């Protein structure tokens, strides 16, 4: 279940965010499957001025990231970390291939959007922290304030999300 998700958008101006940054290896074991929320961005969250430590971004569930998010040797874990923290949508102009595949299978919506449109969303969120971004899977659009943007997702991913096979 899910044709639409709404949540506080979190601006993250970082390119080539790789698996190790999303969830550091020290947190992993191979049979563990719960409680990855503390390991999400665990290194970056050491700084009290990291965006995820700031209200109201600390309660966000829609992540707006730089190009090539989820890059490197992806992990189901990286997707697990985001999900456990409470993020249901990641927006980027380009995803790591392995990461994108894994996202849909895991109940996380990875929306690819034009970079022009990424910089646009960053501005909205940064001028108005708390602004909510909506992702509509039926129409394949992202909405923020009165700005409406198309996004791409492969139909197999869409089908897994819509069928709620999380």
UniProtKB/Swiss-Prot annotation:
Pathway: Amino-acid biosynthesis; L-leucine biosynthesis; L-leucine from 3-methyl-2-oxobutanoate: step 2/4. It comes from Mycobacterium tuberculosis (strain CDC 1551 / Oshkosh). It catalyses: (2R,3S)-3-isopropylmalate = (2S)-2-isopropylmalate. The lineage of its organism: Bacteria, Bacillati, Actinomycetota, Actinomycetes, Mycobacteriales. Its EC number is 4.2.1.33. The keyword Ribonucleoprotein does not apply. Catalyzes the isomerization between 2-isopropylmalate and 3-isopropylmalate, via the formation of 2-isopropylmaleate. The keyword Amino-acid biosynthesis applies. It comes from the Bacteria. Heterodimer of LeuC and LeuD. Keywords: Amino-acid biosynthesis, Branched-chain amino acid biosynthesis, Leucine biosynthesis, Lyase. One of its GO terms (biological process) is L-leucine biosynthetic process. One of its GO terms (molecular function) is 3-isopropylmalate dehydratase activity. This is 3-isopropylmalate dehydratase small subunit. The chain holds residues 3 to 168 of 198 of the full protein. Coiled coil: none annotated. Belongs to the LeuD family. LeuD type 1 subfamily. GO terms for cellular component: 3-isopropylmalate dehydratase complex.
């Amino acid at each position: 279940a899910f044709h639409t998700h709404s949540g506080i958008g979190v601006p993250l101006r970082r390119s080539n965010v790789d698996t190790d940054q999303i969830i550091p290896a020290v947190f992993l074991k191979r049979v563990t499957r719960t409680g990855f929320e503390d390991g999400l961005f665990a290194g970056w969250r050491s700084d009290p001025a990291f965006v995820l430590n700031l209200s109201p971004f600390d309660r966000g569930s829609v992540l707006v990231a730089g190009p090539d998010f989820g890059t490197g040797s992806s992990r189901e874990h990286a997707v697990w970390a985001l999900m456990d923290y409470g993020f249901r949508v990641v927006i980027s102009s380009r995803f790591g291939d392995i990461f994108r595949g894994n996202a849909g299978k895991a109940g996380l919506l990875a929306a690819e959007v034009a970079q022009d449109d990424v910089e646009l969303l960053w501005k909205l969120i940064e001028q108005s922290p708390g602004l909510e971004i909506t992702a509509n899977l039926q129409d394949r659009i992202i909405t923020a304030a009165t700005v409406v943007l198309p996004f791409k997702i492969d139909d197999h991913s869409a089908w897994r999300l819509l069928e709620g096979l999380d």
